[PDB]
Amino acid sequence: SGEYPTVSEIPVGEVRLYQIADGVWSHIATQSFDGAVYPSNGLIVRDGDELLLIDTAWGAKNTAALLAEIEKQIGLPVTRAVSTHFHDDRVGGVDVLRAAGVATYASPSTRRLAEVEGNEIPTHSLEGLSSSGDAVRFGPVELFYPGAAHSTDNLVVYVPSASVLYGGCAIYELSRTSAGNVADADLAEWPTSIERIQQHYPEAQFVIPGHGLPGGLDLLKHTTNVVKAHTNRSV
Ligand SMILES: O=C(CSc1nnc(-c2ccccc2C(=O)O)[nH]1)Nc1nc2ccccc2s1
Ligand SMILES: [Cl-]
Ligand SMILES: [Cl-]
Ligand SMILES: [Cl-]
Ligand SMILES: [Zn+2]
Ligand SMILES: [Zn+2]
Ligand SMILES: [Zn+2]
Structure with a gap:
């Protein structure tokens, strides 16, 4: 996505x-x-x-x-x-x-x-969509609730015809290496929720964060790394 x-x-x-x-x-x-x-x-x-x-x-x-x-x-x-x-x-x-x-x-x-x-x-x-792991079809996409992450309610969206995973604010772009807005986040659960996304959409080819440049599934591990590091920057 050089032109992104x-x-x-x-x-x-x-x-x-x-x-x-x-x-x-x-x-x-x-x-x-x-x-x-x-x-x-x-x-x-x-x-x-x-x-x-x-x-x-x-x-x-x-x-x-x-x-x-x-x-x-x-x-x-x-x-x-x-x-x-x-x-x-x-x-x-x-x-x-x-x-x-x-x-x-x-x-x-x-x-x-x-x-x-x-x-x-x-x-x-x-x-x-109220329990973590729940997925429902909605027209040309699937909606998935991976569990609490950036917020308790965050959903992700998959487009199966295009292998496009829209992660929303639960997924960070690579350039972001510090936490964004985490006022409503569940830091304790966020990596588990990301794991659920990986497990449900391992075929995803094009991953879009809530903010910034798209990439591949590498963005998920990247976000986990950032979230864990933030979790440990406590005291
Ligand atoms: O939505 C929120 C607060 S909650 C929130 N959710 N995501 C973010 C965010 C933001 C910038 C960079 C990264 C993130 C992130 O996902 O971590 N912030 N503020 C807004 N301010 C304005 C001002 C003008 C018009 C619309 C809006 S929306
Ligand atoms: Cl309406
Ligand atoms: Cl309507
Ligand atoms: Cl808000
Ligand atoms: Zn209506
Ligand atoms: Zn938000
Ligand atoms: Zn956001």
Whole structure:
């Protein structure tokens, strides 16, 4: 993915798409906060003549830009969206999606945590994902709950036609060698949850982190290394 869009190349408010395979793209957007600029990834998966969106692009502004970029580059309607955890980097644009007629989804756990946090709440509930190891089909992807990691509710998404594993914020890019936002993380369980992902999707060829550059399954071991090191940086 030498051409993969990087954080320093995208102005805040703009969205890039990157086609991974036939009918599979990532979306990349940047936002500035806490003194820095960060990239964020989501996924777009074609299903017939419609699109499934995985995660919004930061907030409302970026998510409007996302819908506009999808229209320009793909030109098919986004009919459903799934948010992979309750934080604003995953649900921040949910009301923009709802206003545009997109049916928004998340697990009951995500919906609950979003409400508590004061974050936008996806409309529909995804059933069958409440116990670690649970997997359910959703249109052209499989949704998997690996257990608590970056957050207690984090989901991962696999596209079996393309061998694409979207890890969300439970998986770090290689360039990140220190913990990111871990305020809601379960450090004790995070490596076990990663092990479940490895065991369930060992065939994955293209692994996309919540933020930054894609790679292969090596990203999973990398993330475990970072998480364990952070766990030991305690006192
Ligand atoms: O979503 C959160 C906090 S929870 C969270 N979940 N993931 C992150 C994250 C962020 C940057 C780099 C790495 C990570 C990570 O996954 O570790 N943070 N803050 C947001 N601030 C803004 C401001 C503007 C518009 C949208 C948003 S969303
Ligand atoms: Cl948040
Ligand atoms: Cl709806
Ligand atoms: Cl609906
Ligand atoms: Zn998060
Ligand atoms: Zn609906
Ligand atoms: Zn994140």
